[PDB]
Amino acid sequence: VKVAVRVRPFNSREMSRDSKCIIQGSTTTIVNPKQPKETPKSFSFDYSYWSHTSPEDINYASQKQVYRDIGEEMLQHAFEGYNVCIFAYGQTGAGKSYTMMGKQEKDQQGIIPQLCEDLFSRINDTTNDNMSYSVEVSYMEIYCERVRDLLNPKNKGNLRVREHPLLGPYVEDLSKLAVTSYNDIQDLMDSGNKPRTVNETSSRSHAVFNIIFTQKRHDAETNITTEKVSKISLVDLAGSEEGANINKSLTTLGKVISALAEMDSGPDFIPYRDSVLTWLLRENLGGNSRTAMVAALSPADINYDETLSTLRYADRAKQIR
Numbered sequence: 001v002k003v004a005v006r007v008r009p010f011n012s013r014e015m016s017r018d019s020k021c022i023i024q025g026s027t028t029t030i031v032n033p034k035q036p037k038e039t040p041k042s043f044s045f046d047y048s049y050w051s052h053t054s055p056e057d058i059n060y061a062s063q064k065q066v067y068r069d070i071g072e073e074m075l076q077h078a079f080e081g082y083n084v085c086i087f088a089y090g091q092t093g094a095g096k097s098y099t100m101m102g103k104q105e106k107d108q109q110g111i112i113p114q115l116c117e118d119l120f121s122r123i124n125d126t127t128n129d130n131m132s133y134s135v136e137v138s139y140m141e142i143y144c145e146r147v148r149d150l151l152n153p154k155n156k157g158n159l160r161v162r163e164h165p166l167l168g169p170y171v172e173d174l175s176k177l178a179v180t181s182y183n184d185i186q187d188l189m190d191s192g193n194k195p196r197t198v199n200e201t202s203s204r205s206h207a208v209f210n211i212i213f214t215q216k217r218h219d220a221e222t223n224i225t226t227e228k229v230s231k232i233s234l235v236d237l238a239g240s241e242e243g244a245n246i247n248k249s250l251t252t253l254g255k256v257i258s259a260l261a262e263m264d265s266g267p268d269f270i271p272y273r274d275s276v277l278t279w280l281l282r283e284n285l286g287g288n289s290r291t292a293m294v295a296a297l298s299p300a301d302i303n304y305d306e307t308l309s310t311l312r313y314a315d316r317a318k319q320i321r
């Protein structure tokens with residue numbers, strides 16, 4: 001797996017913009033009529049999430065759905081070790097926040113909230129007297145190559161993304177604290193999401209919600225616990241590139257995709273330092289550790305270029321490991 005796209009019914013700016021929809025299969029239809037042409041195409045897109053109507057519409061991409069499809073499977077791999085990713089990419093107002101952290105009230109949740117929950121349930125259901133996992137998580141915002149401990153509001157004893165000669169990239173301490181208890185964990189997020197509030201320009205940033213699943217198996221053959229960790233990173237990178245303000249953020253990443261998108265002739269040295277964001281995630285992005293994506297589109301015809309822009313180099317995610 002690795003890719004999917006999701007469209008949002010309509011937002012105010014749209015609702016009053018007397019703008020209807022262009023995006024109507026398993027693939028994305030994309031028209032424009034304000035040029036003539038019929039194109040572009042539909043593109044593969046493992047998943048072309050249809051959520052244009054109302055959660056009452058039988059034909060509706062339910063929240064629980066997107067999870068049981070991308071997240072669920074993505075959580076499974078974790079148990080069997082192997083790290084994983086899930087980025088919500090977009091165009092400001094595309095639907096990234098919802099599809100990752102939705103809304104607190106019953107129903108309207110993201111994959112994050114559901115994923116942990118699963119994890120948590122996954123762990124307490126138990127089955128054997130030697131589990132021992134312990135949940136370790138962190139919530140950072142990457143703004144102008146300038147992280148921020150959404151977990152610990154006043155941070156401290158920090159700087160940027162440092163590289164551990166062997167353990168891989170990380171950051172100066174930051175904030176890392178177990179808790180074990182969905183509710184305990186659930187809370188963390190909350191506090192976090194709030195740590196950011198300047199239109200909310202919290203957009204020119206990207207929030208990484210990474211968790212450290214450590215697995216300790218008991219031998220039952222010459223006592224010998226076995227440390228089996230997995231890294232679970234879900235991000236909501238910036239979106240939409242009138243284009244007041246720039247910064248590596250995008251590009252950095254904008255560079256990686258061209259990379260993982262470049263095999264030719266049957267089946268590398270990988271270029272991501274040049275991509276601070278990719279930095280944060282080594283193996284999980286450069287070979288090893290499966291990875292899936294979610295793009296959120298806007299039904300508005302007033303947004304046919306940016307969105308379309310999204311579809312294309314979304315379709316582009318087809319080549320690497």
Ligand SMILES: Nc1ncnc2c1ncn2[C@@H]1O[C@H](COP(=O)(O)OP(=O)(O)O)[C@@H](O)[C@H]1O
Pocket residue numbers: 006007008009011051090091092093094095096097098099239296
């Ligand atoms: N599939 C969906 N179902 C219901 N509401 C949605 C959906 N997708 C987006 N939204 C709406 O859009 C808003 C959030 O979009 P958002 O994730 O914040 O944008 P972005 O992350 O691209 O900046 C919410 O207030 C929500 O009502």
Ligand SMILES: [Mg+2]
Pocket residue numbers: 097202203
């Ligand atoms: Mg947002």
